[PDB]
Amino acid sequence: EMEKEFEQIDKSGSWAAIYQDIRHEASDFPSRVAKLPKNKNRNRYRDVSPFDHSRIKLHQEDNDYINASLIKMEEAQRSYILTQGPLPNTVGHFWEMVWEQKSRGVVMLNRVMEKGSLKCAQYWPQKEEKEMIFEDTNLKLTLISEDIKSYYTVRQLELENLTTQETREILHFHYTTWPDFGVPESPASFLNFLFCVRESGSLSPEHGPVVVHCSAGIGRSGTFCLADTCLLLMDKRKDPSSVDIKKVLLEMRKFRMGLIQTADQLRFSYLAVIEGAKFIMG
């Protein structure tokens, strides 16, 4: 069981100790490509790089690099692309990746501005009539519709490969209310967000992996995937309580470093899964 296991840590306060064991056990893989100098402006944080083994490659010949990782959860049969909030110079790459990976959903867990600084570029159009052209990657992005809700917004976008004139509907699931500090108090809205992404079919294998990012693409991003996978595994397994969220996180950290940036985020993932497991079964 993992809910009793929750109190066990809450009462001992030892979330730090747990989370640090995760950091200590977490896999360590080369990120050669990320650290190459030409890609230095393709990274938002020096300390957040995709492993070479799991990194998304852009179908460019020059520089296939984007700071994005395929998290492939075999047991849960879920894939996610975790990426950083795009940079001014990588917005085109981000959409190229979306396109090339046949993603349906983009999940954004941060605001463009947080704590008075730009956490990522404004990489989607904010008004229907002001489409975005990404000339480097020959993509056109159009806001089609936007459903703004209390804790998150869902945007229908139209991504058009200008080279081939195919267009796809991309959903942009934008969680707008993660607090500037720490983590939400209840996971209720994060789960509604997750279930919203789920209900869209953006997590389903008929599509490319969902693209999820926050600023680094590991903190809140990790929390999103970890909760989704954990919940999906609880539905899939004969014994739901057997789902060990540390074990899941560690599996996910084989694909991208840093997933879950703090013990408070770890705690919240527990909360999210614990509370999420409840909701599924009614």
Coordinates of C-alpha atoms in Angstrom, one line a residue:
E1 CA 0.0 0.0 0.0
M2 CA 1.1 3.6 -0.7
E3 CA -1.5 5.7 1.2
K4 CA -0.5 4.5 4.6
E5 CA 3.1 4.8 3.3
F6 CA 2.1 8.4 2.8
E7 CA 1.4 9.2 6.5
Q8 CA 4.6 7.3 7.3
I9 CA 6.6 10.0 5.6
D10 CA 4.3 12.9 6.5
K11 CA 4.6 12.2 10.2
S12 CA 8.3 11.6 10.1
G13 CA 8.6 14.7 7.9
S14 CA 11.2 12.6 6.0
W15 CA 10.1 13.6 2.5
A16 CA 13.6 15.1 2.0
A17 CA 15.3 11.8 3.0
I18 CA 13.0 9.8 0.6
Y19 CA 13.4 12.2 -2.3
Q20 CA 17.2 12.3 -1.8
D21 CA 17.3 8.5 -1.9
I22 CA 15.5 8.8 -5.3
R23 CA 18.1 11.3 -6.4
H24 CA 20.8 9.0 -5.3
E25 CA 19.3 5.9 -6.9
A26 CA 18.3 7.8 -10.0
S27 CA 20.0 6.7 -13.2
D28 CA 22.9 8.6 -14.7
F29 CA 23.3 8.5 -18.4
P30 CA 25.4 10.4 -20.9
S31 CA 23.9 13.6 -22.4
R32 CA 26.8 14.1 -24.8
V33 CA 24.6 15.7 -27.5
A34 CA 23.0 18.1 -25.1
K35 CA 26.3 19.4 -23.9
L36 CA 27.8 20.0 -27.3
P37 CA 28.6 23.7 -27.7
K38 CA 26.4 24.2 -30.8
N39 CA 23.4 23.1 -28.7
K40 CA 24.2 25.4 -25.9
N41 CA 21.5 27.9 -26.9
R42 CA 19.1 25.0 -27.3
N43 CA 19.1 24.4 -23.6
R44 CA 17.3 26.5 -21.0
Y45 CA 19.1 25.2 -18.0
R46 CA 22.7 23.8 -18.0
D47 CA 21.6 21.3 -15.3
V48 CA 18.7 19.8 -17.3
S49 CA 19.7 17.9 -20.3
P50 CA 18.2 14.9 -22.1
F51 CA 20.0 11.6 -22.0
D52 CA 21.4 10.7 -25.3
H53 CA 19.6 7.3 -25.2
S54 CA 16.2 8.8 -24.8
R55 CA 16.4 12.1 -26.4
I56 CA 14.1 13.2 -29.1
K57 CA 15.8 13.8 -32.4
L58 CA 14.5 16.4 -34.8
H59 CA 14.3 15.2 -38.4
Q60 CA 16.8 17.8 -39.4
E61 CA 20.1 16.8 -40.9
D62 CA 22.1 19.7 -39.4
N63 CA 21.1 19.7 -35.8
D64 CA 18.6 17.1 -34.6
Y65 CA 19.0 18.3 -31.0
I66 CA 16.1 19.4 -28.9
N67 CA 16.0 19.3 -25.1
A68 CA 13.4 16.6 -25.0
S69 CA 13.2 13.1 -23.8
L70 CA 11.0 10.1 -24.7
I71 CA 9.8 8.6 -21.4
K72 CA 8.6 5.2 -22.5
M73 CA 6.7 3.4 -19.7
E74 CA 6.6 -0.2 -21.0
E75 CA 4.3 -1.6 -18.3
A76 CA 1.9 1.3 -18.4
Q77 CA 2.1 1.4 -22.2
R78 CA 2.4 5.2 -22.0
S79 CA 4.9 7.4 -23.7
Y80 CA 5.6 11.0 -22.9
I81 CA 7.9 13.5 -24.4
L82 CA 9.2 15.6 -21.6
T83 CA 10.8 18.8 -22.8
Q84 CA 11.8 22.1 -21.6
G85 CA 9.7 25.2 -22.1
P86 CA 10.8 26.2 -25.5
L87 CA 13.2 29.0 -25.9
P88 CA 12.8 31.9 -28.4
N89 CA 15.3 30.1 -30.6
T90 CA 13.7 26.6 -30.2
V91 CA 10.0 27.3 -30.6
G92 CA 10.3 26.2 -34.2
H93 CA 12.1 23.0 -33.0
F94 CA 9.4 22.4 -30.4
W95 CA 6.7 22.4 -33.0
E96 CA 8.8 20.4 -35.4
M97 CA 9.1 17.9 -32.7
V98 CA 5.4 17.9 -32.1
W99 CA 4.9 17.4 -35.8
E100 CA 7.5 14.8 -36.3
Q101 CA 6.5 12.8 -33.2
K102 CA 2.8 12.9 -34.3
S103 CA 1.9 14.3 -31.0
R104 CA -1.7 15.3 -30.4
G105 CA -1.4 17.0 -27.0
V106 CA 1.0 19.5 -25.6
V107 CA 0.9 19.8 -21.9
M108 CA 2.2 23.0 -20.3
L109 CA 2.4 23.1 -16.6
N110 CA 3.9 26.6 -16.2
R111 CA 3.0 30.2 -17.1
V112 CA 5.0 32.0 -19.6
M113 CA 5.9 34.4 -16.8
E114 CA 6.6 33.2 -13.3
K115 CA 8.2 34.9 -10.4
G116 CA 8.7 37.9 -12.7
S117 CA 10.8 36.0 -15.3
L118 CA 10.2 34.3 -18.6
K119 CA 9.9 30.6 -18.0
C120 CA 9.3 29.9 -21.6
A121 CA 8.6 31.6 -24.9
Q122 CA 5.1 32.4 -26.0
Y123 CA 5.2 29.5 -28.4
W124 CA 1.5 29.4 -29.4
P125 CA -0.7 32.1 -30.9
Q126 CA -2.9 34.0 -28.5
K127 CA -5.4 35.2 -31.0
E128 CA -7.1 33.3 -33.8
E129 CA -6.2 35.9 -36.4
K130 CA -2.5 36.1 -35.4
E131 CA -1.1 32.8 -36.5
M132 CA 2.5 31.9 -35.8
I133 CA 4.9 31.0 -38.5
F134 CA 8.1 29.2 -37.6
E135 CA 10.2 29.8 -40.6
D136 CA 13.2 27.6 -39.7
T137 CA 10.9 24.5 -39.4
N138 CA 8.4 25.6 -42.0
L139 CA 5.4 25.3 -39.7
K140 CA 2.3 27.4 -39.2
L141 CA 0.5 27.4 -36.0
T142 CA -3.0 28.8 -35.6
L143 CA -5.1 29.2 -32.5
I144 CA -8.5 27.7 -33.3
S145 CA -10.3 27.7 -30.0
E146 CA -9.5 28.2 -26.4
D147 CA -11.4 26.9 -23.4
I148 CA -10.3 28.9 -20.4
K149 CA -11.1 27.4 -17.0
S150 CA -10.3 28.1 -13.5
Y151 CA -7.1 26.1 -13.1
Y152 CA -6.3 25.4 -16.7
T153 CA -7.0 26.2 -20.3
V154 CA -7.4 24.0 -23.3
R155 CA -6.5 25.3 -26.7
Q156 CA -7.2 23.8 -30.0
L157 CA -4.4 24.6 -32.3
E158 CA -3.9 23.8 -35.9
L159 CA -0.4 23.0 -36.8
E160 CA 0.3 23.0 -40.5
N161 CA 3.4 21.6 -42.1
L162 CA 3.9 24.3 -44.7
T163 CA 6.2 22.1 -46.7
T164 CA 3.5 19.5 -47.2
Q165 CA 0.4 21.5 -46.3
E166 CA -0.9 18.7 -44.0
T167 CA -2.5 20.1 -40.9
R168 CA -3.1 18.6 -37.5
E169 CA -5.2 19.6 -34.6
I170 CA -2.9 19.9 -31.6
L171 CA -4.4 20.3 -28.2
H172 CA -2.7 22.6 -25.7
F173 CA -3.5 21.7 -22.2
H174 CA -2.2 24.6 -20.1
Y175 CA -2.3 24.3 -16.4
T176 CA -2.1 27.9 -15.4
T177 CA -2.4 27.8 -11.6
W178 CA 0.6 25.9 -10.4
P179 CA 1.7 28.3 -7.6
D180 CA 4.9 30.3 -7.9
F181 CA 6.3 28.5 -4.9
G182 CA 5.9 24.9 -3.8
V183 CA 3.0 22.8 -5.0
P184 CA -0.7 23.0 -5.1
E185 CA -2.4 22.3 -1.8
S186 CA -4.9 19.8 -3.2
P187 CA -4.1 17.8 -6.3
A188 CA -7.8 18.0 -7.4
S189 CA -7.3 20.5 -10.2
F190 CA -4.0 18.8 -11.4
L191 CA -6.1 15.6 -11.7
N192 CA -8.9 17.3 -13.5
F193 CA -6.2 18.5 -15.8
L194 CA -4.8 15.0 -16.2
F195 CA -8.2 13.5 -16.8
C196 CA -8.8 16.3 -19.3
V197 CA -5.7 15.4 -21.2
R198 CA -6.6 11.7 -21.0
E199 CA -10.2 12.3 -22.2
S200 CA -8.8 14.0 -25.2
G201 CA -7.0 10.9 -26.4
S202 CA -3.7 12.7 -26.4
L203 CA -2.2 10.1 -24.2
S204 CA -3.4 7.2 -26.3
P205 CA -1.1 5.2 -28.6
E206 CA -3.1 6.1 -31.7
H207 CA -1.0 9.3 -31.3
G208 CA 2.5 10.3 -30.9
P209 CA 3.6 10.9 -27.3
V210 CA 2.1 13.8 -25.6
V211 CA 4.6 16.6 -25.2
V212 CA 4.8 17.9 -21.7
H213 CA 6.9 20.8 -20.4
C214 CA 7.1 23.3 -17.6
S215 CA 10.1 25.4 -17.4
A216 CA 12.7 22.7 -17.1
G217 CA 10.4 19.9 -18.2
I218 CA 11.3 17.7 -15.1
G219 CA 9.6 19.3 -12.1
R220 CA 5.9 19.6 -12.7
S221 CA 6.4 17.7 -15.9
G222 CA 7.6 14.7 -14.0
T223 CA 4.7 15.0 -11.6
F224 CA 2.3 14.9 -14.5
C225 CA 3.7 11.8 -16.1
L226 CA 4.4 10.1 -12.9
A227 CA 0.8 10.5 -11.8
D228 CA -0.6 9.5 -15.1
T229 CA 1.5 6.3 -15.2
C230 CA 1.0 5.4 -11.6
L231 CA -2.8 5.7 -12.0
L232 CA -2.8 3.8 -15.2
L233 CA -0.7 1.1 -13.6
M234 CA -3.2 0.9 -10.6
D235 CA -6.0 0.3 -13.1
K236 CA -3.9 -2.3 -14.9
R237 CA -2.6 -4.4 -12.1
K238 CA -4.5 -7.1 -10.1
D239 CA -3.2 -5.4 -6.9
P240 CA -3.4 -1.6 -7.3
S241 CA -1.7 -1.0 -3.9
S242 CA 1.4 -2.8 -5.4
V243 CA 2.1 0.3 -7.5
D244 CA 5.2 1.8 -6.0
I245 CA 5.5 5.4 -7.0
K246 CA 9.2 5.6 -6.1
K247 CA 9.8 2.6 -8.3
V248 CA 7.9 4.3 -11.1
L249 CA 9.7 7.5 -10.8
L250 CA 13.0 5.7 -10.8
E251 CA 11.9 4.0 -14.0
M252 CA 11.0 7.3 -15.4
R253 CA 14.3 8.8 -14.4
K254 CA 16.0 6.3 -16.7
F255 CA 14.6 8.4 -19.5
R256 CA 15.0 11.9 -18.2
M257 CA 16.9 13.3 -15.3
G258 CA 15.5 15.3 -12.5
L259 CA 11.9 14.3 -12.9
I260 CA 10.4 15.7 -9.7
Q261 CA 12.6 18.6 -8.6
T262 CA 11.8 18.6 -4.9
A263 CA 10.5 16.5 -2.1
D264 CA 7.4 18.7 -2.0
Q265 CA 6.8 17.7 -5.6
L266 CA 7.4 14.1 -4.7
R267 CA 4.8 14.5 -1.9
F268 CA 2.4 16.0 -4.3
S269 CA 2.8 13.2 -6.8
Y270 CA 1.9 10.8 -3.9
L271 CA -1.1 13.0 -3.1
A272 CA -2.0 13.2 -6.7
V273 CA -1.9 9.5 -7.2
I274 CA -3.5 8.6 -3.9
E275 CA -6.3 11.0 -4.5
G276 CA -6.4 10.0 -8.2
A277 CA -6.8 6.3 -7.4
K278 CA -9.9 7.2 -5.4
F279 CA -11.6 9.0 -8.2
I280 CA -11.1 6.4 -10.9
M281 CA -13.0 3.7 -9.0
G282 CA -16.3 5.7 -8.9

